[PDB]
Amino acid sequence: VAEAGEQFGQLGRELRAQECLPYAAWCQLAVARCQQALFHGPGEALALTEAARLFLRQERDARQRLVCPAAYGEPLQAAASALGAAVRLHLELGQPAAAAALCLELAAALRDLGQPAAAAGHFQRAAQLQLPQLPLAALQALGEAASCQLLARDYTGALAVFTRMQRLAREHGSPAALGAFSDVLVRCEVSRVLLLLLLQPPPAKLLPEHAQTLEKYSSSGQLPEELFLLLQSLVMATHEKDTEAIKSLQVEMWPLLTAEQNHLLHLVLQETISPSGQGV
Amino acid sequence: GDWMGTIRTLTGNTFSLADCIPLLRKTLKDESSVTCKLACTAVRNCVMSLCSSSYSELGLQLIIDVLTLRNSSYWLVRTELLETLAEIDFRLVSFLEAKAENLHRGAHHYTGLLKLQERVLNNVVIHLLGDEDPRVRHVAAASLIRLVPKLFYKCDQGQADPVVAVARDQSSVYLKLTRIYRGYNLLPSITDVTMENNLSRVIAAVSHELITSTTRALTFGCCEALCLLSTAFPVCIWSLGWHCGVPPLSAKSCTVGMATMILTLLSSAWFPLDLSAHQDALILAGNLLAASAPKSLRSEVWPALGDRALVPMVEQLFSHLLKVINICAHVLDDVAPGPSLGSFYHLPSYLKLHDVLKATHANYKVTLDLQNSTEKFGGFLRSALDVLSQILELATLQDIGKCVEEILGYLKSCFSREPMMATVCVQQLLKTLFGTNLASQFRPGLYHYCFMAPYTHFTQALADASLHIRLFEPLVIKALKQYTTTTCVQLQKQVLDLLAQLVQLRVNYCLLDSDQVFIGFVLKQFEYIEVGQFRESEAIIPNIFFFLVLLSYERYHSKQIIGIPKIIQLCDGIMASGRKAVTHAIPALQPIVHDLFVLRGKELETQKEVVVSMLL
Amino acid sequence: IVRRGALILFCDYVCQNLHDSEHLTWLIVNHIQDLISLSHEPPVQDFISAVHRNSAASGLFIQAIQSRCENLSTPTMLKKTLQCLEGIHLSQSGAVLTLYVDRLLCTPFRVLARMVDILACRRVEMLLAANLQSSMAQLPMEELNRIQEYLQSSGLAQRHQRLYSLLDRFRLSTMVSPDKDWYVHLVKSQCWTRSDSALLEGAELVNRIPAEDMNAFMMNSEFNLSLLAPCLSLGMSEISGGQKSALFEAAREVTLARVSGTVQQLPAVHHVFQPEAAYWSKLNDLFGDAALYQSLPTLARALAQYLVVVSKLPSHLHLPPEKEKDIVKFVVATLEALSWHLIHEQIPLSLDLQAGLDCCCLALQLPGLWSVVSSTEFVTHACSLIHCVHFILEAVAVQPGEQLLSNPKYITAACEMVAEMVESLQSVLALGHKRNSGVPAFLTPLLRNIIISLARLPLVNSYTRVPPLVWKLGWSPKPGGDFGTAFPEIPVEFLQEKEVFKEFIYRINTLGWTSRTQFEETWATLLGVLVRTQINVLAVQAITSLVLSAMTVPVAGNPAVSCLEQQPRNKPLKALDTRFGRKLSIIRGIVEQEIQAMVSKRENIATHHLYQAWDPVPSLSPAGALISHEKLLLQINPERELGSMSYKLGQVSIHSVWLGNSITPRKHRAGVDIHSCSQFLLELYSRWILPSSSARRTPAILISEVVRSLLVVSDLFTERNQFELMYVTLTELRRVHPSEDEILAQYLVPATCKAAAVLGMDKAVAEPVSRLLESTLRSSHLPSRVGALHGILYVLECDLLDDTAKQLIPVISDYLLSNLKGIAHCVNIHSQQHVLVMCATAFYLIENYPLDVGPEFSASIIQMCGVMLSGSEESTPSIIYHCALRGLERLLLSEQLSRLDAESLVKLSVDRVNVHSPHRAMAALGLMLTCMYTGKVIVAMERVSVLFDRIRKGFPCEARVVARILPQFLDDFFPPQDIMNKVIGEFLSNQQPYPQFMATVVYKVFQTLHSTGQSSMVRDWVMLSLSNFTQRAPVAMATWSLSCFFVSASTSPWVAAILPHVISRMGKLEQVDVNLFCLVATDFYRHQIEEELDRRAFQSVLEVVAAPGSPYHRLLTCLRNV
Ligand SMILES: Cn1ncc2ccc(CNc3ccccc3[C@H]3CC3(F)F)cc21
């Protein structure tokens, strides 16, 4: 009966006014069970989302506000469980945008809490739910997934995601591109060049799309001309073995790059002077 | 310096303009919010004139220091900041940033760039759409629409640098050489690609905050911002600015933008219960679907739509509209929500919406303010009828033929509360029923801008210069009655437009006005219009003359109802008065001239000669 | 707008009036930069075209550019300049060639320097095509000499070779045996030149210099200081292999000598660096010297590489006490130099920021260097660190008009800056937070750890512990100590405010405690609050965190050095203590060390440095030092994500509680008595959760937070009576409390199981606990099921009764088989903590209960983990992939699996190496190696062909590692003759992306043939292969491949030592490359051949390719008089 659902609602509101977050969230789960018995799926998905927000708040107080070493993460498990249930509801209600929004909310919480590798999977789930109906939102979800994979140090997974983004942005944004998609294309292009200079694939791993990019730097289009000259100079200096060119370029490029791109250019110069995989 | 040297020799005063700016920079940091508000007002008075001067480094420094105020505890400091930042021209600020070498470093020797446009747009204007105060969200939404024309981005096809961008604006002013519903545009728009690029970036940033919003306040503020953008930069004119790729073409161009976000909000358990955010979402959903038109229209349900991917979206919006109009009809008739397409009793989210609307109208029933436009039940009903009127341009008799008896039932409940929009909705039903709606009737640089394009257009111009019908009766009868008992000229215009439409559909006027009472009353209004006693007559005149001119063709009712000789004697009777020609005589002549010369004899030649004697 | 527009209009005019040379001259002479800037405006392009159509105008245009070449040097202005010069008049070709060679060709922008080269080539080609009487009038011999002498003297002639050859063609139209002393000369030709190329190869060359000469070799002024960090890293790989490293001890003495010699150049008195006298003049003279400024980051890079290893060295290699003060002076001077450079000369190199911050981070972690900088003598140094770290943070992170958050006066500024920075760790320095998006990710871990260490200095610590709200509440005690900044601890009446208390808890949790006195003070303060339900809950959370902080390992109470103790449930594997197990531990240890570099979360590693992973596992005995990461190979708990150091349920195993405390069925740590703390809490909590009949009922939130606190602080319990009272209390609580509280159950169930497991799981305990576990696995609430699985894992450590195992194990096995099969095909849409703890439970049952869990269970679990591991990057997350795969390696290496289970893991391991992702392939390679060594034919030849394919298809990182392990794999599974053809073929193949990796594989394979007495076999394979080497298509790569081959084949120790030099010169064909090739081929011919029929065969192969002047013709000329 709905009267139990309103009483659990009142108990949740009062417990939230007392900062009793786990029991306020437990009351919202009791509302979701009342909505399920009434077959009110929209109300159930609402009740589950509010339960998850109270658990995410409890986790943020433990790991962000207080930095407790005893925080092993039990309210994040409760939050992710309730979000997954609300996503499952929105998908059978035929609402992939609401399902994507709850994936982005979990992905954001996981990224903030120091779990980028888990956040990248939820950002890619959001992109796939969005893509057939919201291409530009899906590109915004892939951009966060790439950002997470660089924080997780999965450079080849980031190279794959930026390559998917640039293909999607040409397909949905077009040789000139519309304002929002053009900004996606410039980010992908600069990040992919730096990742190809970091990763240095053999001819077995140069895709047509990767070779087609490195030919362009061996005509700036959407890139600003000064950055395009500096990137062409960096591709030449790394195809030579000119450490003093790469050093002098890194100082000229610093104001023009994002912090994520300045980290990529640091990794290129580091991998050039002290290569990975030698055990020294 | 030349002006200051003159006043210094005349007065002996040692004062300098550079001595003022430190006092603004001090008072922006005052402990009192009222000092801080007044200091923000003082920056609003001078910041753009400073950027336009040899002190333009100080103008740039005031823009940097005022951005602190976004975190203020007082809402009037937040709205003064928004109104201040809306005055700024970012083409000019991008020029000042590009010449700065010390100001990017500031205090503490920073190593990046100022990025002032990104900080204003994202960290202030789009951030304050999430404010818990709706007064702040409204000013943030209004400030964003003022910014779109004035943003600058690199690599733009129309303006490669900020000096070319400032020269376009300065040149564009001084070197300047049936009827479809409000959201439709069938002609190929010619658009500034730079504006369409700016609009694309703004809509992408606001729709990102919408889909990622974790608070009700930010969802509501993003809807308000997108609704007002879709009004100021119409989706049907600016379709590549609105486009997110959803219809897979131009990805003469058309779009539905992000309509799937908005329809998902309209079916949520929470979002429909805020009446202001709900009514913004209806208007935006109507505008987004109407901007598909000539590409989505054909060459079965909704048979006019060849783009079958939009049919679920149109059915969803249309069925939502019928339910929320039926809720308003129940609230106005004071009928309890219990015992076809507008049925809502079995849907708990619509029962919550009913109780919000009932409570809003209960406060209206016990109060007597009649000037307030911000009344939420009336605003909501008006927005739902407006969007239904918009969606009826895509309908056919096969879509409405099961609904028309139902909708006219709801309009009879709603007519007393929103008579003007109920009359518009009747007109769109008549267009859909009779088959007269849209569904049925279907490298640049300084040399270019500062001289060469202006001179090319001027020289080319000098070169060319050398060369179911019975169901409608009680609503038409309500409209004819209320015209005689109202002082709302906006309703009176709309009833004359309904009657003009009935006459053009060849409905017999002797069925509508058998006893001649309506023509008699319309003619008796001219006494009060001529002597200056009919308030807002300037609104009603052109509709009266268009209507009487149509009545001049109906000779076959045994006798002519009025005739051009009487319409001409009414027209110069206005013209002979002390009332201003532009609001009175000219609007009376325009219906007459197009009829007598464009559309339409031994009498007719004399009438044309008499009208030319009035034009002279 | 007017300035630009009026030039455009005046150009449009002059193009219609080209007779009027006065206006053309005035435009060129006074507005050249504006013509070049505006060259894309159509009238300006037409004007430049008219200047190209006129000889005198083109001469004015060139002379004007010469007068502005200190400008015209920004990349886009230089590009526009060359685009103007491209079309210029034929009669001005010598003048523009001069402008190219003596100004524009000197430029640092690499793409623009090739445009100058290409254009200069085109203009000298025009001068060769024109009639010579004109061309020598354009270029006098007294100019033609200058440009060539400059091209040689500036070193451009070895970069712009075509241009110099065209100037040569134009002027012609007008007018030895290898030993120690050879080896030391080869290494000084690479190691006594300033460069940052081939540093890993350069360290390997210095390592083969005799130990007597290394100190003199590294102390010479010419020695490349960039080799010190490589040498320390390479020598640490020898120390950690159980050898003495002569190179490490040489590099240590040279690093400390150069650090001391740099400090001896600073002023004799130190003043605090402030970003806002003669001392500052001395610093401008020191830091403005390009030699001294380049010396600081390069010595800092070596110092950091020594400091990051120092606590793991032999005791004679630790810091000399006499050099601790000089190290602190040097580390301070390096941040002052980086800060001075940021003020005067833009952002430093990222590697140079990193080296300064690495030294600062590592020097604050070591207790000796910490004891110096926390002293009163070092107050100005401590203030300079704080000023420089705050300055560098704002210069990177904070845009102008923003701010970070939104006594001598330098002392007070230092306090406020450290307090502002400690709050920034919530936002600006939180990795992946929205406020961190302006900090590049190489700076965030360094700055976090530096700030936590600076907040612990006696100078600023007590100030930083005061909540900022309490200064706003007007609190105003007079400070007093050696520095004048010792504030008292916050009065307990302020901590009655919720937000003041949240701010206090954050600071004590972030900073930890500096002594047992500060621990006892914060213990007293928190009990003063603990004696409103929200303040009691926060006090229970705070006291829990305080008691748990004593469990942090190498230095308790210090978050900058230490993380929480782990005592893993899994034992050492006896299979490793065998002939094949010891060889597996080497090869698998190479792979594991690279998986740690690629995938580890790195929570306990602040500094950049690969190969620095450690786990917080003490050597445990009844009552030590940390067990090395190479001894915990498959010991760390399966449910812990790699390199995560946070608290988890299962942190400390039941066997470790029994062993360390002797309670089978440490009490003082950092001088804190954790027994009196944990005994006081156990007594206090036992009264609150079982209240008397007259007391008011305890809030449910407080009951749940107290039972959570018991679950956590029971890791510090030391006596059976503590677990007995815990068990009795929680048992009575479960009897009186309402059973539907799934918010309590998630703590109560793990806690009851843990206490029952320590008490030894006897019949009166075990039946209640089994009934609690079986019912909790049916909960609606997932955290409580995860709690039941951790409870199940605690009870599985006991010697259970048969009648409790027969009851319990079927239920656990059913739950695991019902839940894993439903999720294994789509793991990403399910809770990762649920999947990880299920897999850990299944793997513990298969290893420890293989007779009670049915034979279908082991097969079914391996089949489902195979379905997870076969999923795509999106479908199976990387955390589940790596944790399942290390669990399966443990299963196989434990020897409890059947031969059919092992064969199914073989089929899995081989498929999983064939993936795009390098870290997933590297882990699957660990499983395949585990399968092959525990397995001790045509099968092995397939397995080696997977490794050769991973070198050919792989990224350089994965290919390098596969090439490091491959030599031992060949020696362990094959007679040399079976694989010798593949080894030489995969070095020669034109499909090989990495000849430089394979050169070391060929070398190691030929060295094991010499050490095993098979020196008769290397000559068979050199003589057999020589024909195929002469068929390498580029003669440079053919000559180089033979150079590697003869270096690999040689018995001579000094020729065998030069392989890194040969590898560093790949694809070069200079005179020194041909000279070396001839010598290493001569060594093979004089010593490895003796038979006259093989001397004939050797010369007969070279004759097929010995065209005149070729390196082969030089070699036959060298051989034919031996
Ligand atoms: C802010 N807020 N407050 C409550 C609440 C509940 C769910 C969501 C998730 N988002 C969503 C849920 C249902 C329907 C639509 C959407 C939007 C993505 C979109 F479609 F624009 C947000 C919420």
Numbering used by the authors:
A (entry chain B): 43 to 216, 256 to 299, 310 to 371
B (entry chain A): 790 to 966, 983 to 1056, 1062 to 1109, 1126 to 1165, 1228 to 1330, 1353 to 1377, 1423 to 1555, 1563 to 1578
C (entry chain A): 1895 to 2069, 2095 to 2195, 2201 to 2330, 2354 to 2478, 2497 to 2588, 2591 to 2632, 2662 to 2932, 2953 to 3138
What do the study's own words say?
Consistent with our biophysical data and the presumed specificity for the HTT-HAP40 complex, the ΔHDX-MS was localized to a single binding site at the interface of the N-terminal domain of HTT and HAP40, with decreased deuterium uptake spanning residues 1016-1028 and 1073-1085 in HTT and 82-87, 89-93, 122-127, and 133-143 in HAP40. To more precisely characterise the binding pose of the ligand in this pocket, we determined the structure of HTT-HAP40 in complex with **AS-MS Hit 1** by cryo-EM. Based on density fit analysis through Coot, the (R)-enantiomer fit the map features in the binding pocket more closely, with a density correlation score of 0.64, compared with the much lower score of 0.48 for the (S)-enantiomer. To characterize the stereochemistry effects and identify potential vectors for further potency improvements, we performed free energy calculations (FEP+) on the two stereoisomers. The binding free energy difference was 1.5 ± 0.1 kcal/mol, with the (R)-enantiomer as the eutomer and the (S)-enantiomer as the distomer. W1080 showed the largest difference of 1.5 kcal/mol and was one of two residues which interacted with the ligand >50% of the simulation time (**[Fig fig4]**). W1080 was predicted to form π-π interactions with the phenyl (edge-to-face) and the indazole group (face-to-face) in both stereoisomers. Inspection of the cryo-EM structure suggests that the methyl group might clash with H132 on HAP40 (**[Fig fig4]**). The halogenation may strengthen π-stacking with W1080 and/or introduce favourable interactions with nearby hydrophobic residues such as L88 on HAP40 (**[Fig fig4]**).
